[PDB]
Amino acid sequence: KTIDYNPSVIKYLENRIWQRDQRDMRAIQPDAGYYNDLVPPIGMLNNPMNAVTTKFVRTSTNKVKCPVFVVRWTPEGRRLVTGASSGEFTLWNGLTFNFETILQAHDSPVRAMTWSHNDMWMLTADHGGYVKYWQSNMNNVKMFQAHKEAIREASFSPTDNKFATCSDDGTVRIWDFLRCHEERILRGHGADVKCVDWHPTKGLVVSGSKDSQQPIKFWDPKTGQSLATLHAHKNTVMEVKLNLNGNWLLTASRDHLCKLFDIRNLKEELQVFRGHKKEATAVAWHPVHEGLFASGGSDGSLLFWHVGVEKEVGGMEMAHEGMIWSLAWHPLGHILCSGSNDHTSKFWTRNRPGDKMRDRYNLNL
Amino acid sequence: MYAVYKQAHPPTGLEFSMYCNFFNNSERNLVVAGTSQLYVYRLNRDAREKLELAASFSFFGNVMSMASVQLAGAKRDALLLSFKDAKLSVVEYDPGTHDLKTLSLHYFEEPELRDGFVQNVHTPRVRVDPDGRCAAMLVYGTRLVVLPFRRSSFLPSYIIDVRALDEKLLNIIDLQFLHGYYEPTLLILFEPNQTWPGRVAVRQDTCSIVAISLNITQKVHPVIWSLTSLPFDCTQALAVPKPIGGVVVFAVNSLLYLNQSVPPYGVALNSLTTGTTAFPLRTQEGVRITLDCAQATFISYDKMVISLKGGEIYVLTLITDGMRSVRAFHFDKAAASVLTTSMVTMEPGYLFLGSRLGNSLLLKYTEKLATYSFEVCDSILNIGPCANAAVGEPAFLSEEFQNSPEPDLEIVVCSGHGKNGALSVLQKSIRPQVVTTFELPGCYDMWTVIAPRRHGFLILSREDSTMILQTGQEIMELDTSGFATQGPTVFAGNIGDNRYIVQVSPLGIRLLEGVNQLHFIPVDAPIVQCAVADPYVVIMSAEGHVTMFLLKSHRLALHKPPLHHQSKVITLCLYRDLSGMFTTEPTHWCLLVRENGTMEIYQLPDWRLVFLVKNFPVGQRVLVDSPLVKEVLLVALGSRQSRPYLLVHVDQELLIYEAFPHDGNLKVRFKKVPHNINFRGRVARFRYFEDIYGYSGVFICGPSPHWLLVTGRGALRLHPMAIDGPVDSFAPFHNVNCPRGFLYFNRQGELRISVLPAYLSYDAPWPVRKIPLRCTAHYVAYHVESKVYAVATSTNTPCARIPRMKEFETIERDERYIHPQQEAFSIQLISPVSWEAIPNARIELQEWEHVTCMKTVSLRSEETVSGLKGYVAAGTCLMQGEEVTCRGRILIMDVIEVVPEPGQPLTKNKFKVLYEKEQKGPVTALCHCNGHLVSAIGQKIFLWSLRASELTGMAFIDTQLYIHQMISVKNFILAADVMKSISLLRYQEESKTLSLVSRDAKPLEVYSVDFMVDNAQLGFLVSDRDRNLMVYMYLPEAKESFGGMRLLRRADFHVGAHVNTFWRTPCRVWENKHITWFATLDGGIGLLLPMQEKTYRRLLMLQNALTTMLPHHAGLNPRAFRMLHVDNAVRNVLDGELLNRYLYLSTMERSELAKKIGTTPDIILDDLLETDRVTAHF
Amino acid sequence: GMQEIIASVDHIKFDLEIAVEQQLGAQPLPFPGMDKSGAAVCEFFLKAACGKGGMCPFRH
């Protein structure tokens, strides 16, 4: 089975010539015969609902059958890498999602994995507190211990020269990528820090911890001084994700709530995303659509939201049979992957026009 | 590094159309707009019907929506234009200036109105109340700006957040003001819970309508009427006029009529509604159509004209009852027409179809036998989306010009789309077709007369003698008497009604009947200039004396013009007015320029002063009633001589003034016409001609000869003619051997008998021949060794099978089923000799193969003495849905020469396919590199060597998501990704290694890429979806590029149009520079010329001065428009369209601006004119 | 047309082409064992004028 994005790109390129934008785009009928009229999400910018990937594609699982903590796409979408509890990276093809290669990367569960803004480096942390450097060809070039306890998430700077790490020691540490030398140590979280995010352009660090008194803190990486404390959630903020527009902070937490904040004005909340029956654990902004994002849950629910809409624009309550750890969007934005605690990773694509959505993830047959 | 942008060809596409009172409230005009271009047309009932251009304006910003309104006691309709992001400009025509006057510009570009969404996807949509009580502009998709109008003409505007409006109006598909309401009622068609086709099984009835009553005074907007269960595929709404009222909502598969009181009425236009809509829809009988992308307008009440996708025209009838309640729909299929983007109803019976995809058509409808029939009355030329452009050598050039050292080139453009797809041949300059050549040294001036329609004599003037050539079946020197051949001649022409001939000499004036001479009265300073128009003939001496001669029945009478000599007359002009613009049947006027710089126009029979300009030579922008001008010509052009034009020669500058009406003084005013014509025995430079190949116009002689043509369309055309160098004298020539041709002297004393080429049309901004293809033109490639054009074309066929992974299932549906369109591709061969397609030279692609790229590539060959061989390469992709692995083919085609088939000369050229094999992935891009074929197959870029009939791979490299465009120069390949920007590659022949030198790390959705060639600097010109031009440089020593791994943005420019094709030509300083040419997707052609640093700095100070101290159309900011992505920038590209405003300024205003910017007008003019001169190709 | 003949560049020497030949701004390859990937063949190493060995950012 295959999800080949090339026909969509070719159709978009042809339509790109004579259509000014989607207002000139000819409508696709909800019929199975209009297969070659589909375009990637970049084509339908006025309708983000196309990228609500509630169509199941493939369940990708390892032979070890162990929980999957982080899934990431190769920056050009050629491959997908999963970080598992066995400290291994499994690579899956971006078109025919088959197993390609496996390697014992870390000695402890892979909790963090991120690619540099330039498509040259993949930084991965693990449960033992080490940080590893990776080449596009999955070659390890450097290894050092950043924290004495588990590192949860790492984020890169726009120029990829500096990166931040969050650990269970309650400290966020800024590092120099070339030197592997820590420059600042950020303190103020009383409990384990579970998520860290670097501002897309500006020099800002947003962090989320288990400390109820200091749930979210904003940092100044160059000076090392905390800028603000955000009393967003009352229970274990799990995710902090700044949108690439540099204005929105997206926070998932154990309090069954996902929240959106304007980092310029943190007095109030822009939006609260209710609809998770259980704890909200994962989240991922859409690469193409600004306001669209997908969130995961501890019961296995995988929901879709858009900024400005009260209720979910879609979702699958039984997407996984376990807590969803990581959500990764394909660079083109037409395939969504989900790493869950149920020892499996699943690929979700856009629903083909003319489908009677009576499958187990949408309805009952 | 530094460069200047110049627009070679203006955009032709049209996107908005309306029929409003542009000039006055006594006549309504067709106001159309495209991308930064606004046109105002008139409807001419005598020509047959033809659209006459009345005005044209350019903006520093693309129009996003256009509308009109009559505000309060106004003499004409105001125009409401919206520009990207949030700008609303209210522009009104200025009768006293013949220009656009800005009434107000409203800015709504605040971060708080954007709600954190940096990427704007909602164009500002301006709507007007039918009653003219307010105007609404939907801003960012969530803010509704209400601009009230007083019933000083405007009221303070307020912004309504549609999200906090009773309900939550999200998305918003369309919004229209409704008829028949006491207060402005705006009907918003929106989608609170958006869905898309594909997720309909879980969400079907998502669209809704809400009618909000806008209270202007109290700023309250309550909801008065609402529906919630409309079909998801609603696309647009149309307010039905007052007698019926309500709203007609267009859905993709259905048509709905909705009103406040009656229950909703809707019908299903096809069987596709079943299972995708729960709305109650009747089955409309006999109709299988789709209303997804359709333009509609109300020709009258209860009847609608709808233009569908595919161009089909339908007449929709609202069948009602005695209570005006719609109960049924009647659909009548009229004749098909052009793919339109806008529609508007002119005077009843006429319907204009604005189009940016093919030529815009003006239609006429008549009731047949209810039903209507449509006929085409006019057609506005539109070189549509320029998907690709090919440069090639014209097939026919004169043997006289064969040895010219500047190459002769033409541009072939893949324009239009679908049924309107075509090939456009574009040439900037006119190339004469020389019949025979005469070498006649010593003749500096010519005149051609009509002997008792055909020209019978050719009068040539020497320094001390005169040559008379009698023209007929043979041209022989006339040595017989009758003509004054013993001295030079000042002027020779036809007097009366082409029955007599008048010949002017410095000694006197004589009347001539053919070879016979009637009488010769001496005239006494020697005569230096004479003007002849009707019996009235005026004579000017060397000292400014003016003498007038009248043809009194026939004999030339003497009449002394009463003129007080305050200042010496330096030049004269006569003009016959046939169109009654010179109001205060034929009437006669004399244009006169004095030494003190005052232009005076007199009524010729009585010599009464009617017009006066206080400071004429300075070149004022607008001439109103009350140095060293060398020549003036006042002529009426257009249909039935409708457009009076004034051409002025002064101090190496050309002044063109377009006469426009403005109310015992002459009720006419002149407006300067922008142009780029450089002027850097009294011989007249301006030669008026009628009927050269059917065209009326004026020829301008000098260093830069030009053709000034104005047809019945009313648009001024200026075509250069420099293939033969400067032209000294010019004359029309109608002969048996030279039918409707012309006649001119080259600067070498040679005389050309030449005619205009027939295959081109000169009624366009560029001489163009548009070849209809009836299918979509994708790529065009020119072959040099065969001198032919290869074109990849696709046509739409109904889809009947669905590939599955390989099996195909036949689409079995109902009879009312709309089959999807399937494209079938073919490669055509076009002969430039006769632009018809070559028979039996057509290659058909496979069933689902799509031509993603087709290029002409030079590859190594041993048979050719040179290294390269120059084939044509094509790359294809089998589009069979996302569920099937896409793979492609490489097609290497050679055009050979064979014996022509009898009776078919074009059959000499035929394809020879050398390579056609299946690739290991989709072939998405192609180019050549040192004789090696470079192909982007899948997510890798390969390099092949063509030997025998098999491609051997040499080197490959991994690349980005999808490489669509790819160009190379000197083993440096520049590859562009669809959304991950550009990458620079290097090929080393010795090691056979393909390596990545640098790439742009930041994401960018690239349209096409080229190179910017300087003396030693190599740039990378990039075009993006945001309509911007970026120049990237490889600067390893720069700090921003960490190790030479980041391409640095060094020049930035926002061209208001998308660019998909590029080409480069050498300069016509400028030692090793190449102009980067590009054709936009809006039908325009632009260039980007590299420039020196000091020249750039001086012209940048000039540009800043022009931006600051000069008012602009619609109040837009030229600097803000050219800023990148505003609707980290490096402003290193200048705006030639803005820099051209210095040429349009008067000599005075130029002097003060040069004083302000601390330089001199002569230096600024030299720089600007050098930029103009080096780019005079095609 | 046929750009290569109407607009010839073979007589033009580009500063960009000089940079790749002389390897301007060739920073030493970091993280010994980086193994690189898309690096070009080192021109200096061909003529035995490459000071960096194994540490060079280009193929040898």
Ligand SMILES: [Zn+2]
């Ligand atoms: Zn080296």
